[PDB]
Assembly symmetry: C4
């Protein structure tokens, strides 16, 4: 007995409890902490890990100068245990990557890193610490993936990739792998729809993803993947937009099928089905990546509901946030009969918003519980500028 | 076979042998050492760990500026092995917390961290590295806990919490948990009595705690918890006060039922029943947190005894001390038939007493043995001010 | 079940996927990273490790002054997991050595370090973390070895050593060991031929090595070792030279038996048999250790072929490279039926080519896959000079 | 199966091969390395560890100022794997101690640290990471022990302690322990003889120690302990003195029963019985702690032999040495049928000999092999003064 089932329903939860906080930038003032982005969480049967992209550079060093390309040859995926800062001396090497996803099937870690050139990039699949397969760019335009946990059901692991334009129609694929080896792929037909940077989780033996529309939608697309790779694709039905930037709530009319709101740009974000309701994350500000709030919509997975019945602030609107993503706790760690829904929020510090040569981020992680949880702000807390500035 | 019984009597001991000393502040002059408070010890079947609260900041860095609130959003519970300094690169993440307790039931670590807002704070229970339950503030006034080892008997783990005023009547609860899940709670009726920051241990299959009175008592309250959660509550009978600040010994009349001494303030401290005698810890000074001595009182658990029959100095009255707390060694590590009683002393350095921007502490840990042990001073030993000062 | 068989054929592969990159020098600007050379990779059943030679000195420290002899008494072999920087606090001690090889037989690591004086040096064999045997210099002229993975087949581990002149005829031996103990040696007769710094791998139950000629050959010698230690020895047949320095390709006529090209000097490098084809590594420049390319030659293992059918650039010719070496993934990690061929490239920074007091290197590791992989440059990326300069 | 037998003869060896070298001071110029003394080696069934005494202070920090007492309250015993520098972030806490011994019985580590006051000091026995027993000073004059590996035979572990004057008659005891608990002690009658800082090893099911005479002997005492604690005591028979300081070899007449040479002072050192021969370590200089040489004396364990038949220099007489001590490799690591004899040499840097505020040391470790090994110098190699100077 070794593979995780993950065929159970997602736990229905009234609130989200603080899991961990790494304080990485604050520690980085003096300690040896990588400059990072996308601090995503994923879990095995023994514990949860925080994954992150590095530039081979440390905070308070000249190499942190953020003029370096995002898609550089120095870009690597590394990991630490959840709540550990992304420090050099505890870190584990996962992949060469400027885009990533990772997940644990119950026996080993699977990690996928995209590197190489824009026009012909390479996704290298790792399983158990070594390359086992690859996917080459199929559309020759920045092959890329979730930047969050992929999802593993019964020994088969699932993720979503995109190749094509960052601001108009692109192409989308879902992938399936067992023990490091790709055993199926499907092209997701979604004309007029855009998909990036999906936040996925298991629920009831399917994969559900809530992704980012970077073309015209201030709502988030939703992708529901069956193990045979038939999928359903559309938009989160709810009548509140959860992308950033977005328009006022009052203005918004939702749509189960179309992007709405007619604005470009975006941020990675997430949501969890709760029967027919939905929990949705978003920044507080509609115009910038500041603040973090999670909102439950009555019937918001099946209807263009604006029925808000819960709201918990996790980062206040005076503080910088960023990407967020989803994962779940396995049953063997949680001890429950359902899959506990959890999320992470990245808190971006430095350039552009602040006068620094560098940019990094830290995180606050939260897990669904059966109780209301009070509002508070678990913000980054670093004091900028730093010495190297 | 996995759960620890801890149903055995506490070892009767004539003295306390040095276990470990981390030298954390001294190392922090150059190494990457968290700024800490409450360095409590707790043990599993494989070893003992030192837990501590951090601020996400390191010694000799600007983030150590101690103007930050105690109950900040950066506050986390972390741990290292006993005698390791609270350094970043060996540390293990336990909880987001500005108040904590932890203990090991024989299979996994249970850790409890309180964070969130004063008026509606959240205790998050961790078991095996993940959230499994919570307790929300029931009195909306700084929900808080032991800052020391909780106690585990036969797979059920016990701790004490307080919600209410820091200087007058507050409310007190005891909690019981199995595998991360709360299975019972009881309100402790104690009118006119105050309870904070309890130091508890197993003895004979009950939980005994020696807590801090921050209202009127220079004596320490005592709480004795049966596994069904019926409890006995009162004050340590002995005719010597062990709180700080306190009045002269000669002045003092003890009380098995009431606080005595009629002074406010306090410090976390401890004691161990020895049949009907008691070992009690206290600072040497009656007015400040300087020095550390442990005293055995003949019949001091059952009578208002002033019969002192042993005294061992562990920190001299020229050196700063602080909180102290209790724990026990499991039988599987100790190899004995009784539960060895052990304690830790925190040694506070920096503000208020010394001219620094920061405040941290280090520790000396001691374990009961069957021999008299000579007086000495295992003091912190750091040389202040530091560079950042 | 514990010993690795490694009796399987080498995987036939169309390309090489990025495995890892440590970014060691970049991190060394601020972190505590050894000054290194020869960052070779070798793997066990549980993972792959990067081995390296240190000088007991760190980057950005006065001890990194590179006036110290290469064959100094401070020289040690240490290791980290693949893709971890050669940092002090994750490193594992392997041997005292200014020349090395290491490999894992399926039960334990075998490590061999040469130290001591030029005229009578000592190779100390380590197995399972302790000395188990030695080989003393047999020719009293810088006893030395592969600086890469040795090769283990069925519990017996194989390596090649050289004792004698660095620029003319020297003497060569192959060694065989089980559980740390030498069980056979053979002198390799190779008059007029030179062998240094062999890069070997298992294939079909023999050991094949592609070594460096430092006397007259711009082609590489090839050594094929049977388990009874009979061997075949000659030169890589192919009509393209893969040493550096070398002459133009157009000029070159290959030879299965003789060194060709009539130039001295050299660099450690590698190649893999693919049935009758060969993959060969080389620097891009013919005159300096800049760039890295891998080329497949149709029939290049059996014929003086110039039939190039694949070429993948891994480091561009604007960036410094260095030594390269080979290893293979075990079947138990890879999950395949063949031995996946992998290599590493060292990227040298600092003196001579650059104005620094020091010299170190970092690495990019690559593994054979069943797909073409696009050209790119995974270069070191450090920004020199450093502070200590 | 868990306890080590260690009832086998000591391997007869013709030379000593380099095991490891930590380079600790050199790394300490930039890394976070404890200021140490007595870097002794001891081994379990899984590997060998280097133990060391720290002051809670790091190299290049103001706390390294060596005005601090040797017997301070900050003094702790810590350990790392053999060949790792004594760095903070890999170190393991063993005991509070300004004098120590440690050894592994096959199941757990036993560690013994002496701390507390000169006139009534406490040895705390640790087994499996916790206190299990103590020995209080019996003569009220600096209770102290080997500063090297103790010796474990069949689950019973043996060490030697001294209480009394450092320069004239003192009292000596041998101790026996199983699973952390003292099960026997014996007073060693040795009138006119002095014993300090014994270097012991198992051989043929007894414990043999070669100790330091700090009173009148430039020869070393020898102690042979049977498992029932009857002992034989005398001096190493050989006609060459191995203490430092000592008189010329030519002058010396050995003695199996008496100290000879009539000089005070001393240094910890070692020797190994080889049937009736002896290997003996000593500094090269007769007047200072410089150089290291090992010499085999024909019949030197049973006769006042001056028959020198082997000599291997390990540190040259231009370089600082210091204490040395003995240990053995277990059969389960070594794979042999005899106990391999190994030793360590400490290389002292800084005050007194050099102009520094601090004093620390590094080490070179060596293990017996069946071959002559060439002369060389594996010296410390640090470049003093350091910055803090
Ligand atoms: Ca959008
Ligand atoms: Ca009080
Ligand atoms: Ca050549
Ligand atoms: Ca002497």
């Amino acid at each position: 007995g070794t593979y995780i089932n993950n065929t159970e329903p997602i736990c229905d939860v009234k609130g989200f409890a603080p899991f961990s906080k790494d304080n990485g930038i604050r520690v980085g003032s003096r300690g040896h902490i990588f400059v990072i982005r996308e601090p995503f969480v994923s879990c095995s049967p023994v514990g949860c890990r925080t994954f992150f992209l590095t530039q081979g550079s440390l905070l308070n060093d000249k190499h942190s100068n953020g003029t370096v390309k995002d898609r550089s040859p120095f870009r690597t995926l590394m990991s630490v245990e959840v709540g550990q800062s992304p420090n050099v001396y505890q870190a584990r090497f996962e992949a060469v990557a400027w885009s990533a996803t990772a997940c644990h099937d119950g026996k080993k870690w699977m990690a996928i890193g995209v590197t190489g050139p824009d026009s012909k990039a390479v996704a290298v699949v790792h399983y158990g610490g070594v390359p086992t397969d690859v996917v080459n760019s199929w559309a020759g335009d920045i092959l890329r993936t979730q930047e969050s946990s992929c999802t593993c059901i019964q020994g088969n692991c699932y993720w979503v990739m995109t190749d094509g334009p960052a601001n108009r129609q692109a192409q989308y694929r879902i992938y399936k792998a067992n023990q490091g080896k790709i055993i199926g792929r499907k092209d997701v037909s979604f004309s007029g729809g855009h998909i990036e940077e999906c936040s996925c989780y298991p629920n009831d033996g399917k994969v559900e993803c809530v992704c980012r529309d970077n073309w015209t939608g201030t709502n988030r697309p939703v992708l529901i993947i069956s193990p045979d790779l038939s999928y359903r694709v559309g938009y989160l039905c709810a009548g509140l937009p959860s992308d950033t930037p977005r328009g006022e709530d009052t203005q918004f009319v939702g749509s189960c099928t179309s992007p709405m709101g007619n604005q470009g740009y975006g941020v990675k974000g997430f949501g969890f089905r709760q029967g027919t309701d939905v929990w949705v994350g978003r920044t507080i500000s509609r115009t910038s990546r500041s603040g973090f709030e999670i909102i439950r919509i009555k019937n918001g997975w099946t209807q263009t509901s604006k029925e808000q019945i819960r709201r918990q602030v996790v980062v206040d609107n005076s503080n910088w946030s960023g990407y967020s993503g989803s994962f779940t706790l396995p049953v063997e760690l949680s001890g429950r009969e359902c899959l506990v829904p959890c999320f992470w929020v990245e808190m971006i510090r430095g350039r552009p918003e602040e006068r620094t040569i560098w940019t990094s981020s830290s995180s606050i992680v939260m897990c669904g519980v059966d109780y209301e949880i009070a509002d508070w702000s678990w913000h980054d807390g670093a004091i900028l500028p730093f010495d190297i500035d």
